[PDB]
């Protein structure tokens, strides 16, 4: 249909030439130098609605046994509970703080330590944008390490049938390599940029929809496009 397709709710991202790490660092550098005004112009929980959009993009799959990594205040877990009941949903976070249905089973643990188990659905909403005063590599390394935690859940003998994985910094070499590997492991997976996400971040989501390859070139298109739209939204 005109709805099922796009680029209505996600950006159109065809592969393009270029180095996504260099372009990503470039537009991060540009954004760090913006005035308060420029940055403003460009700039149980809200995640609930976010996941709704994402799960609708995936044609509303049956979720079954679900683990929600970095569950935070619980918007995603609450959405799963409303969709299918509290029986199949497990939330993992370091407890900030739980705003969701208290009947949802929760584990207070660091997702980097916890050994994975077999799930039907894998959710991950970890990641943090760093503020301007830091060396760029600190944000890159922090979010890379977080995604590495997701790797063990993806690479187990029976991988998740559904997954929604947030990629905070999609242009690092490790992020791209991980996404390519999960595509080989699962035979699935597409990286999307939500239309209407803030331009002040670089967030994409890896969804278990039909395989879409050439992730590196599409991340390049995404970072170039993002740099353009950040520039556009300037005074005067
Ligand atoms: N290493 C880690 N282990 C477990 N949780 C972590 C973590 N690093 C960050 N987090 C947690 O992950 C959460 C991500 S915010 C996720 C919000 C949630 N999806 C919602 O809709 O409400 C934060 O609350 C943070 O406390």
Residue numbers in the entry: 42 to 84, 98 to 149, 154 to 294
Per the authors:
Alongshan virus (ALSV), a newly discovered member of unclassified Flaviviridae family, is able to infect humans. ALSV NSP1 is a typical flavivirus NS5-like protein. It carries two essential enzymatic activities: the methyltransferase (MTase) and the RNA-dependent RNA polymerase (RdRp). The flaviviral NS5-MTase functions to catalyze the methylation of viral RNA cap.
The crystals of ALSV MTase bound with SAM and SAH were individually obtained by co-crystallization at a protein/ligand molar ratio of 1:3. The structure of ALSV MTase in complex with SAH was solved at 2.1 Å, with Rwork and Rfree values of 0.210 and 0.236, respectively. In each case, clear electron densities for the bound ligands were observed, which enabled us to define, at the atomic level, the SAM/SAH-binding pocket. In the complex structures, the SAM/SAH molecule fits into a conserved pocket located at the edge of the ALSV MTase core region. The pocket is surrounded by helices αX, αA and αD, strands β1-β4, and several adjacent loops. The SAM/SAH molecule lies down in the pocket, within which the bound ligand is stabilized by multiple hydrogen-bond interactions. These include residues S99, G129, W130 and D183 of the MTase forming five hydrogen bonds with the methionine/homocysteine group of SAM/SAH, and amino acids L148, N168 and V169 mediating another three hydrogen bonds with the adenosyl group of SAM/SAH. For ALSV MTase, the binding affinities of SAM and SAH to the refolded enzyme were determined to be 8.1 ± 3.3 μM and 4.1 ± 1.8 μM, respectively. In ALSV MTase, this loop is of short length and high flexibility, devoid of any stabilizing contacts with the SAM/SAH ligand. SAM/SAH binds to ALSV MTase in a 1:1 molar ratio and 2. the SAM/SAH-binding pocket in ALSV MTase is largely unoccupied during expression.
